[PDB]
From a paper:
Several natural systems exhibit ‘facilitated dissociation’, in which an effector (E) can bind to a target–host (TH) complex to form an excited ternary complex (THE)20–26 from which the target dissociates quickly. We set out to design protein systems that undergo facilitated dissociation. We use a switchable target binder (host) and a flexible effector that can rapidly bind to and switch the target–host complex to induce a large steric clash with the target, forming a strained excited ternary complex. We show here that by explicitly considering excited intermediate states when designing coupled protein systems, a broad range of facilitated dissociation systems can be designed.
Author numbering: 2 to 124
Write the structure that this text describes.
């Protein structure tokens, strides 16, 4: 609950930032910062589901940047498809998902094709 409540607080900050942001570069920097805060906070609450924490960090960045996403469940795996990203947003999202996965001890696979980044979170 504490981790889910933290996501909600960071989501409101993410939506207020993009409202007053000066560009996609500033929004991206703030989005990576928010995702790291959530990841480190969730790591301090080991009782919370590690797989779900990674997904919440991804969704926090998706909402902060205002990009389109899709989620599909395959048993224990979760696939996230994020479209419309520029080159800088792809590199930062790849970087942030890798770091967040390592913090949570979760195995994730990342594929980049065109504007589309596909993330698979397992177990």
């Amino acid at each position: 609950e504490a981790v889910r409540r933290r996501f909600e607080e960071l989501l409101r900050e993410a939506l207020a930032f993009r409202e007053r942001t000066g560009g996609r570069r500033e929004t991206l920097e703030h989005a990576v910062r928010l995702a790291r805060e959530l990841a480190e906070f969730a790591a301090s609450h080991p009782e919370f589901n590690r797989q779900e924490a990674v997904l919440l960090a991804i969704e926090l960045m998706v909402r902060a940047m205002g990009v389109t996403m899709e989620t599909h469940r395959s048993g224990n795996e979760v696939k996230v498809v994020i479209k419309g990203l520029n080159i800088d947003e792809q590199r930062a999202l790849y970087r942030a998902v890798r770091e967040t996965s390592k913090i949570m001890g979760v195995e994730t696979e990342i594929e980049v094709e065109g504007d589309t980044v596909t993330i698979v979170v397992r177990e």
